[PDB]
């Protein structure tokens, strides 16, 4: 896990995943914090979002726990910043790397997944009343992201 994390860390400052930057804060190497810039021409445009990448001692056999810190109005991310993303749970592989988990998250941001929701209310509003959704998401970004 040590060399794994360390090495995976240098690889970040090798090909910085565009639109985001995660890195260990403090001296603890099992607690990182990442940023993700609202994908462009998406309602989350302009804002910035903070996250918490907590590596368990079982990494990489167990997926890392990644959560949003910054509030965000999205169908697959709740008020705790919990992220319903398959590679974080069911489809995780010891070969997968953070730089890949971050971009995967930026994708979920611009192109939500309304059919495997975590927050039903939003999913619906996103399916039926799409323009409403953009209005709101855009407002939440103005409150907690900026």
């Amino acid at each position: 896990a040590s060399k794994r994390i360390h090495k995976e860390l240098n690889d970040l400052a090798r090909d910085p995943p565009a639109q985001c930057s995660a890195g260990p804060v403090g001296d603890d190497m099992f607690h990182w914090q990442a940023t993700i810039m609202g994908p462009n021409d998406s309602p989350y445009q302009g804002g910035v979002f903070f996250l918490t990448i907590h590596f368990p001692t079982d990494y990489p056999f167990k997926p890392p726990k990644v959560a949003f810190t910054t509030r965000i109005y999205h169908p697959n991310i709740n008020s705790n910043g919990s992220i319903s993303l398959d590679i974080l749970r069911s489809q995780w592989s010891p070969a997968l790397k953070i730089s890949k988990v971050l971009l995967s998250i930026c994708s979920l941001l611009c192109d939500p997944n309304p059919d495997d929701p975590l927050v039903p209310e939003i999913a619906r509003i996103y399916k039926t009343d799409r323009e409403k959704y953009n209005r709101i998401a855009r407002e939440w970004t103005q409150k907690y992201a900026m």
Partner: protein, 76 residues
């Protein structure tokens, strides 16, 4: 052409189809014999997830080939 779709419980779905049916339609047919919607279905065959964009010819799903009904329920 006749095939079997086995559920994880045991009960099996015998059905009628042309070798050119898009997998997506095997689901539309299963959606009337069980009520199970298509977006919550996964038909596994010999350890392979048979996409919707293909047909019964693309995977050589012939007369009597058994696929499976593994319900994609868990959410994300």
């Amino acid at each position: 052409m006749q095939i079997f779709v086995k559920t994880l419980t045991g009960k099996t779905i015998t059905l009628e189809v042309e070798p050119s049916d898009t997998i997506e339609n095997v689901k539309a047919k299963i959606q009337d014999k069980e009520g199970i919607p298509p977006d919550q279905q996964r038909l596994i065959f010999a350890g392979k997830q048979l996409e919707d964009g293909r047909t019964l010819s693309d995977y050589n799903i012939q007369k009597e080939s058994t696929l499976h009904l593994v319900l994609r329920l868990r959410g994300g």
